[PDB]
Amino acid sequence: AYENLMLRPACPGNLSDTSTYNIDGACVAQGDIEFGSAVQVVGIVDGVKVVTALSDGGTPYGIAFRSQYEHLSGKILDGEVCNVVSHGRVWALTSLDEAPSLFSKLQFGSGGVVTGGSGYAGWTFAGGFVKHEDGYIIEVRVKQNAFIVPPP
């Protein structure tokens, strides 16, 4: 990336390939959510889902999507409708420096940022690793019905 290239490779929170994607449009935000980073489903009120940034003890649901009409501030603010990529292939945010093994199940922590691989169940790492600002961007192959919330 960076110099010696006419175009920057990719930007976080955007789809990479046009292959069987699904975007939910009936969602509401509880706190400030940044593009990329997994989200939870706190509850459902009259059909819509109230999504929050990932926290401890919560199963991720999807990755936030970038729209240039809904959000005119560079991030999703409180009390704003948002799009969530429930299924597809999207660029996410990571706190890594080296690309993991191919088709390895990623792990999420902190505010929905990827901390490492070598998981047991969940989404997988596609082929992609680019540099962004001060850090890297990872490509995540989101699949629906991947994380099952544990029984109490």
Next chain:
Amino acid sequence: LIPPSMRKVLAIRMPETTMSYLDYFKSQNSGIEIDSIAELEDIDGAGTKGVLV
């Protein structure tokens, strides 16, 4: 075609003339046209840097 570092190399004035290394080569034959291509800083996997005439 040169990488954009050899342009820095060939910008020095010649020891005791009134021309730079980038102009004497430009003044030969009828006219030579030097420009810098960015992809020539990596021709193989690691790096070699190349020039085409």
